[PDB]
Symmetry: D2
Subunit: 86 residues, 4 copies
């Protein structure tokens, strides 16, 4: 979860499998500054949902969609549970 | 809507049905500060979404799930 | 810690000053439904600051702009002065 | 503007430098799946500001961060810290 740009340039393939599995960002350090590698799905999803949050009513529309079905229930309970653990 | 504090005071109960129905906030003017009246479900969903947005993976999980 | 709509309609004015002085939203419970009353400023800032994070890269520019706000007009003029 | 991991591997050092100079993220595509590389300072601002936004008070404070009067603040400051 933190490594030199030097160790990361060798190890990009497994770092990318990594961020896409455990969904944990990787800090890459460097003399010319530090960087974060992350799952590109996660990042994109994060942007696109903030895109939809133009107002409280959209946040409400999101929660409902989540309340609609059993897969919504699953995904939302796991998120709250993640939260509850930290 | 967009009204005065006295206008908002006498009209307060229909304002609460209005907010719970059209989900639009109501801007109340007063020389003591402006205020917004919004539905409680809207407020709670907004604040909850923002809290859940702490983890980016959560967004991806909100997304994947609606699409189920 | 909520208040009934009837108590709210009564005390609207002091509720309004108070939502703006202490900036804490008040929850209103009624037979007509539930509401939250908060300052227009908290509400505008909530919506706009989220809109700005549409690009995660705005976060740092928000942080720095607010830092330049707290610095004062003072920091600017000195910048201007350091010269060619 | 996405590059292959095989490209990212080659110019990893200038890429890290770019991301931090430009304050723009880079999308890396690879046989191992997709990633986004971003300045660490800016990832951090981003996680922190979303954390702060839970609260509408903190949000207000991000919007609203902001003489003879101002003179005397400076005077008191100095008096209080000298």
């Amino acid at each position: 979860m933190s490594i030199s740009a030097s160790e990361a340039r060798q190890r990009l393939f497994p770092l990318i499998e990594q961020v896409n599995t455990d969904h944990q960002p990787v800090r890459i350090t460097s003399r010319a500054g530090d960087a974060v590698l992350m799952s590109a799905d996660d990042y994109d999803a994060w942007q696109e949902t903030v895109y939809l949050l133009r107002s409280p009513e959209n946040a409400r529309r999101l929660m409902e969609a989540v309340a609609r079905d059993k897969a919504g229930h699953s995904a939302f309970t796991k998120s709250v549970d993640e939260l509850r653990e930290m």
